[PDB]
mmCIF file of C-alpha atoms in Angstrom:
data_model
loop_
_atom_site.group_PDB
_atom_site.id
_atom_site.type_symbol
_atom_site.label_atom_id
_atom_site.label_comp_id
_atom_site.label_asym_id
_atom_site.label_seq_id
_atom_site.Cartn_x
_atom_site.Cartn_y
_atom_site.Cartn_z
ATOM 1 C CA UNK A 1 45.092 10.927 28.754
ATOM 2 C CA UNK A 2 41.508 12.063 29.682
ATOM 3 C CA UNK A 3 42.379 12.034 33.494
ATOM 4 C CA UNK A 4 45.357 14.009 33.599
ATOM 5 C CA UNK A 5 44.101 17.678 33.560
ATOM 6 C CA UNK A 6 41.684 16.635 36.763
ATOM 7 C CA UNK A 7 44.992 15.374 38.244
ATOM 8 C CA UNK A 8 46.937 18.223 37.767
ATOM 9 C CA UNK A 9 44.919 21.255 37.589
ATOM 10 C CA UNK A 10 42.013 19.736 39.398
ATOM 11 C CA UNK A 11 40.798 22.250 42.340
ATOM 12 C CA UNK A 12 40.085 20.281 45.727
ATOM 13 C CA UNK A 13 37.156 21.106 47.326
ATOM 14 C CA UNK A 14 36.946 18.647 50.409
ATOM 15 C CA UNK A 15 36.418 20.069 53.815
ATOM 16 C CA UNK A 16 40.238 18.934 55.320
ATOM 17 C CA UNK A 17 41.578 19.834 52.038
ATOM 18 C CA UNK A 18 43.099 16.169 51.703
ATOM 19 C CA UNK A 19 43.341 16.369 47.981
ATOM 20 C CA UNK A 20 40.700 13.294 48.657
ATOM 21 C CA UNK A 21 38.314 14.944 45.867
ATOM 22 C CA UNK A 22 39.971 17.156 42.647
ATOM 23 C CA UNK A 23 37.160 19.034 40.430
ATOM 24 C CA UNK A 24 37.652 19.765 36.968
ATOM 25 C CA UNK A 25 34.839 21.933 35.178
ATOM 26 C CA UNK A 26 34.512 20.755 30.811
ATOM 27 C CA UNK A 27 31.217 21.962 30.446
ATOM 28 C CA UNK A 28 29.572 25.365 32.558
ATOM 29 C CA UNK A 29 26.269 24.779 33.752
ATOM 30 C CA UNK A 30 23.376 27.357 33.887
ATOM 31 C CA UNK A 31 21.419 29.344 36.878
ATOM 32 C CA UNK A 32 23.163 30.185 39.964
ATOM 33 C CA UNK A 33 21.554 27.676 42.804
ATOM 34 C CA UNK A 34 23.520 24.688 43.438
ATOM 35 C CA UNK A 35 21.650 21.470 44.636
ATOM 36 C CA UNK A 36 20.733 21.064 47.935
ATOM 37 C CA UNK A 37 20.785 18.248 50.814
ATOM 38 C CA UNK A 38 18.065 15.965 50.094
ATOM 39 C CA UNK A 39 17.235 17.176 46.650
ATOM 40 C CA UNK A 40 16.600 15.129 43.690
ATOM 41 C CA UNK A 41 19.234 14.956 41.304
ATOM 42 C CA UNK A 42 19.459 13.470 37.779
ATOM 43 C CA UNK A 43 22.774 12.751 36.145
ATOM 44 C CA UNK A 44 24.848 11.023 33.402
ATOM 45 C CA UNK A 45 28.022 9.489 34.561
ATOM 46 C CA UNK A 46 31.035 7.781 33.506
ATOM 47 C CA UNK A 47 33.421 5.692 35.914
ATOM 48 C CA UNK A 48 37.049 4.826 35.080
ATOM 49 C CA UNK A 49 39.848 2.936 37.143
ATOM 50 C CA UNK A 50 43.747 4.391 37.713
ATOM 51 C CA UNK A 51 44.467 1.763 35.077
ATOM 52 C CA UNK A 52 42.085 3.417 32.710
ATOM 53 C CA UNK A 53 39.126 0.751 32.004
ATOM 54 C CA UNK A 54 35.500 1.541 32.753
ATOM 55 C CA UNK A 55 33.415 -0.038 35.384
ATOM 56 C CA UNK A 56 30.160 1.915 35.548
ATOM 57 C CA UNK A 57 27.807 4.090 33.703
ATOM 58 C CA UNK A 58 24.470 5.307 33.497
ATOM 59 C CA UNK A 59 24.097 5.305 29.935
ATOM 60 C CA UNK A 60 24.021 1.292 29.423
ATOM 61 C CA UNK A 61 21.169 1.124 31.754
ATOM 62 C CA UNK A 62 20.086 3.730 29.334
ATOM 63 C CA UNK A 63 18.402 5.767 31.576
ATOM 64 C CA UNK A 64 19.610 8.760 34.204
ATOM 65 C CA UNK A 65 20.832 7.926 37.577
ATOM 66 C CA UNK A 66 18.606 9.488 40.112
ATOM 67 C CA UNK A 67 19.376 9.874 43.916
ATOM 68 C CA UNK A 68 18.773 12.103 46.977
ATOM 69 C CA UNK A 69 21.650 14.069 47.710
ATOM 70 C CA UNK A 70 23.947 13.984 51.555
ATOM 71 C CA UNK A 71 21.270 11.240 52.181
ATOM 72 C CA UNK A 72 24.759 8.742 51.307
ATOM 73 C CA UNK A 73 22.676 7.148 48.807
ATOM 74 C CA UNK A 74 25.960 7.582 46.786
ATOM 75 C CA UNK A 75 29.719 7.312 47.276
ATOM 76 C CA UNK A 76 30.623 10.703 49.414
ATOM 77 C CA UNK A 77 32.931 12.190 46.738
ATOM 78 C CA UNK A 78 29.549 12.037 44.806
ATOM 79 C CA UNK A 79 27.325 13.588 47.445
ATOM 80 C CA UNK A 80 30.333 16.647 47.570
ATOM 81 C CA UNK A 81 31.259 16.999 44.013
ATOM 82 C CA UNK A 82 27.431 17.051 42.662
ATOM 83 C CA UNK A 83 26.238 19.601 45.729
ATOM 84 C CA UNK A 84 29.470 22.377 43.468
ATOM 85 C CA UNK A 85 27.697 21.474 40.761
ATOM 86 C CA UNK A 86 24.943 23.386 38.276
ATOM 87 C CA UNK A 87 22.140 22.326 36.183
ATOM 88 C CA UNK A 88 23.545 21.355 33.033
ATOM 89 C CA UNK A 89 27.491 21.463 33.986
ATOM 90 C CA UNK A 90 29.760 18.739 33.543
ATOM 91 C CA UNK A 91 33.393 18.085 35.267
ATOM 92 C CA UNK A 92 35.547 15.745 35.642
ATOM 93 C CA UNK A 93 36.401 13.969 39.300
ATOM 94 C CA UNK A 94 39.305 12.132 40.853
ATOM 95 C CA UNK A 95 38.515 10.595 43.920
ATOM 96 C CA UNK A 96 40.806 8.988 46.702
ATOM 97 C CA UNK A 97 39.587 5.798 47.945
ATOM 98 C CA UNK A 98 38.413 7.894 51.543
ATOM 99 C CA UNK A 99 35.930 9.664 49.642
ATOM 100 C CA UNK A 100 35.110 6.192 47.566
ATOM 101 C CA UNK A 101 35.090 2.618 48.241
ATOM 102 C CA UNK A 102 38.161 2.833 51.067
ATOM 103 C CA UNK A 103 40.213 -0.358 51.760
ATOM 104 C CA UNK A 104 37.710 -3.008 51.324
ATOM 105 C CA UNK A 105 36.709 -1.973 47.499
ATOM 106 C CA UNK A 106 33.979 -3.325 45.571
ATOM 107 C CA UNK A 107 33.520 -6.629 44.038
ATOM 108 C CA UNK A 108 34.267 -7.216 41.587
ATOM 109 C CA UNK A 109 35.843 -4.716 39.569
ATOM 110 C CA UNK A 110 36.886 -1.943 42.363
ATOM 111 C CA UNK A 111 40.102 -2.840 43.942
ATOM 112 C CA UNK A 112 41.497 -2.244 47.456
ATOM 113 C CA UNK A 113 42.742 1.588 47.994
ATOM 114 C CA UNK A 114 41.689 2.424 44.834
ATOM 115 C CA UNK A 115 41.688 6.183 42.951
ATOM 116 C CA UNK A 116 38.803 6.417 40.981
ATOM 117 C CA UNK A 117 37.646 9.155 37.812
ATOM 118 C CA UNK A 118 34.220 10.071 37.295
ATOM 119 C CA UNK A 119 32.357 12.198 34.712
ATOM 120 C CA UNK A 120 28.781 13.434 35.925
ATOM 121 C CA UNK A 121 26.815 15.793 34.029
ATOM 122 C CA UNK A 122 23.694 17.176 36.058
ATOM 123 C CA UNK A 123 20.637 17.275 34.195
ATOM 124 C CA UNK A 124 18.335 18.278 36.236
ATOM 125 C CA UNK A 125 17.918 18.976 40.289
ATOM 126 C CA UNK A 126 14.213 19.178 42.176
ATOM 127 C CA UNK A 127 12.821 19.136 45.815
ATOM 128 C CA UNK A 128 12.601 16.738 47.954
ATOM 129 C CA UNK A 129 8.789 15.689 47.910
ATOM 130 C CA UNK A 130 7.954 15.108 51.315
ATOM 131 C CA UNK A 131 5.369 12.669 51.212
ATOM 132 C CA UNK A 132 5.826 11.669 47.470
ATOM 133 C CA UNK A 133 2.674 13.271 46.426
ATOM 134 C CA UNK A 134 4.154 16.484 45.784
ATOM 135 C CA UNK A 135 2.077 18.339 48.644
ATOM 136 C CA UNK A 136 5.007 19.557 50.710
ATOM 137 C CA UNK A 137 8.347 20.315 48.987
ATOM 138 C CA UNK A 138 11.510 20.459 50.716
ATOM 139 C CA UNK A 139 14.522 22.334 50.206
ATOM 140 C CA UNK A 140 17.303 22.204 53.168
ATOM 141 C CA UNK A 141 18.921 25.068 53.446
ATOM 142 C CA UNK A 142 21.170 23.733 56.423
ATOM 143 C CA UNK A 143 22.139 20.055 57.594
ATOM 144 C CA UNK A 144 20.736 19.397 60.974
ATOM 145 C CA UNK A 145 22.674 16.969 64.175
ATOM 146 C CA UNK A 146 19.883 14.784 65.221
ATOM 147 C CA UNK A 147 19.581 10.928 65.975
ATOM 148 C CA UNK A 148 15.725 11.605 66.416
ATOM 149 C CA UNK A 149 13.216 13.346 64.642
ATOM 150 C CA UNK A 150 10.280 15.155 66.240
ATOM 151 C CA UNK A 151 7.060 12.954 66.932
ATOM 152 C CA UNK A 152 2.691 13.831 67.334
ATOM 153 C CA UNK A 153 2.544 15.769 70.471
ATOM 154 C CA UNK A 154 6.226 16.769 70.613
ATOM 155 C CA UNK A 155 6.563 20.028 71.892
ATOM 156 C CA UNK A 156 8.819 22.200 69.491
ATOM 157 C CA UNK A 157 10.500 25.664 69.039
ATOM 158 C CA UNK A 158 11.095 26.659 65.966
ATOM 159 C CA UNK A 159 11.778 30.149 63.947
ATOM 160 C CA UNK A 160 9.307 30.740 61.322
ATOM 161 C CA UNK A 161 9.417 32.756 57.825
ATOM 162 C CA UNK A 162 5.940 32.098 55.849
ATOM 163 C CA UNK A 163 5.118 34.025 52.201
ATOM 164 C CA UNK A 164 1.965 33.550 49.901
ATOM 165 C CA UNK A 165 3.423 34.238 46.493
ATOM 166 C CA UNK A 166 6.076 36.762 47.153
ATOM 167 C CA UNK A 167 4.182 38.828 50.027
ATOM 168 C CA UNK A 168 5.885 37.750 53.559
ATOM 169 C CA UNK A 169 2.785 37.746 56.317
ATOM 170 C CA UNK A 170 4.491 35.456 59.280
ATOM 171 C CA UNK A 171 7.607 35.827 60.575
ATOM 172 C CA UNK A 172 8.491 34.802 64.654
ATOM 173 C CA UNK A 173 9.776 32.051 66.611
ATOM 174 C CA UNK A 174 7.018 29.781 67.596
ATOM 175 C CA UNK A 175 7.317 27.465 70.705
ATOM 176 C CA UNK A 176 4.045 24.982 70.222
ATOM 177 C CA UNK A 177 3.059 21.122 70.033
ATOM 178 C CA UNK A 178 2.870 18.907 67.367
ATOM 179 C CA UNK A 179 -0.159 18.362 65.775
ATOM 180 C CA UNK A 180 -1.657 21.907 67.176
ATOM 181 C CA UNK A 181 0.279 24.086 64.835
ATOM 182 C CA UNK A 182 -3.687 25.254 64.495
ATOM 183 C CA UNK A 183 -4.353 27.028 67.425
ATOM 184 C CA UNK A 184 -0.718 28.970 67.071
ATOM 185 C CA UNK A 185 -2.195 29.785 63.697
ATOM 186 C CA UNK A 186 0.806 27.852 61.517
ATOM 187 C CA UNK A 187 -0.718 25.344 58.541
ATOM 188 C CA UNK A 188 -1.052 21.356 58.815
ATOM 189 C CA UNK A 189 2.322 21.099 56.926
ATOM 190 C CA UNK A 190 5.039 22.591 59.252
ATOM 191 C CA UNK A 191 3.508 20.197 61.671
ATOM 192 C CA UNK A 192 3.466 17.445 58.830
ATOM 193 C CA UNK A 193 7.271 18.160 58.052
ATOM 194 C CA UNK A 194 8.507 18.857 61.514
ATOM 195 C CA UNK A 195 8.405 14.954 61.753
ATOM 196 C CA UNK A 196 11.207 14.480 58.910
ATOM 197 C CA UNK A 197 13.493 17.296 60.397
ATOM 198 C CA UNK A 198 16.171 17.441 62.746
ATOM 199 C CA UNK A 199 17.859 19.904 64.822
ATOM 200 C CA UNK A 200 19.228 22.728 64.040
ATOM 201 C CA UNK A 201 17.789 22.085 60.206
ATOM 202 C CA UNK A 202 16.903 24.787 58.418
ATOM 203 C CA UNK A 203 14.597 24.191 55.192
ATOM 204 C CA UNK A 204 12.941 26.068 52.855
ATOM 205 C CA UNK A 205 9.090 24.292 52.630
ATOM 206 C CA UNK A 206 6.501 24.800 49.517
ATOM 207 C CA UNK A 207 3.298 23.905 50.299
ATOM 208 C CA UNK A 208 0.356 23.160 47.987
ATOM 209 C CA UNK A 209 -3.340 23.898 48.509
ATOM 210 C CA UNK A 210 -4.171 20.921 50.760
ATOM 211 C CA UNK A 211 -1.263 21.377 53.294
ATOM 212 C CA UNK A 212 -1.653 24.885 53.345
ATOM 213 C CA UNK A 213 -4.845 26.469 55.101
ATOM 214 C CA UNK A 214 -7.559 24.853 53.025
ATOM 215 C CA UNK A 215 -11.172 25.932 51.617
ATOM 216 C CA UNK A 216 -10.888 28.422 54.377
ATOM 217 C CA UNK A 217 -7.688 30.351 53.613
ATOM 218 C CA UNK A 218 -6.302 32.851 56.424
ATOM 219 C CA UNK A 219 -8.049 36.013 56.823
ATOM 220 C CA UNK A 220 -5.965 37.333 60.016
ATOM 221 C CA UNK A 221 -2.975 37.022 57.314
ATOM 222 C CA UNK A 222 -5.010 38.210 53.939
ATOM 223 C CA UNK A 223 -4.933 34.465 52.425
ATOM 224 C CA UNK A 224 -7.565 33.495 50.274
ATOM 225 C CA UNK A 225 -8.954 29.655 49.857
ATOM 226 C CA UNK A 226 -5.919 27.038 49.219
ATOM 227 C CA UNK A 227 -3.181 29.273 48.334
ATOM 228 C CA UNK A 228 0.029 27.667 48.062
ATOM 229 C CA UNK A 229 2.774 29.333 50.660
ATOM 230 C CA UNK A 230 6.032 29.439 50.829
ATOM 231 C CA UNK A 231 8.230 28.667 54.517
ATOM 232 C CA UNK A 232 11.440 28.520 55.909
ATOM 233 C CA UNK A 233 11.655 26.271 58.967
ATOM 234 C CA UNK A 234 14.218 26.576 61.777
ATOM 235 C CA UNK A 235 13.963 23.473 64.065
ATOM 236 C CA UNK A 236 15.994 25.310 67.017
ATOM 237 C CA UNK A 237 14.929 22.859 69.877
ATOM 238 C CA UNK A 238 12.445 20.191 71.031
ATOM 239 C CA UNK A 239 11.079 17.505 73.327
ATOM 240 C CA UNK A 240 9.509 14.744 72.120
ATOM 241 C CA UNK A 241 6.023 13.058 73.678
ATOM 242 C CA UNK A 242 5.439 9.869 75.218
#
């Protein structure tokens, strides 16, 4: 029985510790980072009923299942279990219907209340890219709690970490407006990405050439034409504009 070890020996690693999600390592990964919210993850799976039959699996749509990570985009055992995972690892899960498809099920092979077994290898894991022309990368360090999302002309404060290659040249927290990150000296994208953040949201930001400070590079900081920089963004409060 391949789902008895992840039964039995299976670690839980959900956040009220209701045995709702049991982890099971077969394979070790490699690195040390672990995938972050929003990042794009690639995987191989393979899903199997209490009962023992399959249902789903990447592999005869022969291609890699690809989604963005605590966006839900994904059954939340999934969005848990991957985010413990690393590049390359593959384990074994055993999911409670509260972390899967719940009472209702899915048509039409999940059933109602139904305990569910999944085998996900992660193949690879990259940024979230911004405005999917790989100008601004994203990596959240920290889940915001907002129903809103800063606006053009919303007036922000924020704590600010910027690098160009490994030196560190800004580091303060800003209060400023939207749109006139400019005149506070701060590049086109914080003021591009403050507009997909939330607060309290803490992400780590690469920028390329054109959203960093141009042809004209950043003298006042010893940053020569389009160098790509490196930011972490703290969204702690704001007010949006009219």
């Amino acid at each position: 029985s391949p789902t008895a070890t992840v039964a039995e020996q299976g670690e839980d690693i959900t956040s009220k510790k209701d045995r709702g999600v049991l982890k099971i390592v077969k394979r070790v990964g490699n690195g040390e980072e672990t995938p972050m919210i929003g990042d794009k993850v690639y995987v191989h799976y393979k899903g199997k009923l209490s009962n023992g039959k399959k249902f789903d699996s990447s592999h005869d749509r022969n291609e890699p299942f690809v989604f963005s990570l605590g966006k839900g985009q994904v059954i939340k055992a999934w969005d848990i279990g991957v985010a413990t995972m690393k590049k390359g690892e593959i384990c074994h899960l055993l999911c409670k219907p509260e972390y899967a498809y719940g009472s209702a099920g899915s048509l039409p092979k999940i059933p109602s209340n139904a305990t569910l077994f999944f085998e996900i290898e992660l193949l690879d894991f990259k940024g979230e890219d911004l405005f999917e022309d790989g100008g601004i990368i994203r990596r959240t360090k920290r889940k915001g709690e907002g129903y809103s999302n800063p606006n053009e002309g919303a007036t922000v404060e924020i704590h600010l970490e910027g690098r160009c290659g490994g030196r560190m040249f800004d580091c303060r927290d800003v209060a400023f407006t939207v749109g006139e990150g400019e005149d506070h000296d701060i590049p086109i994208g914080i003021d591009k990405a403050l507009e997909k953040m939330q607060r309290e949201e803490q992400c780590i930001l690469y920028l390329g050439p054109r959203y960093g400070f141009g042809e004209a590079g950043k003298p006042k900081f010893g940053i020569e034409p389009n160098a790509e920089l490196i930011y972490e963004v703290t969204l702690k409060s704001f007010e949006k504009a009219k």
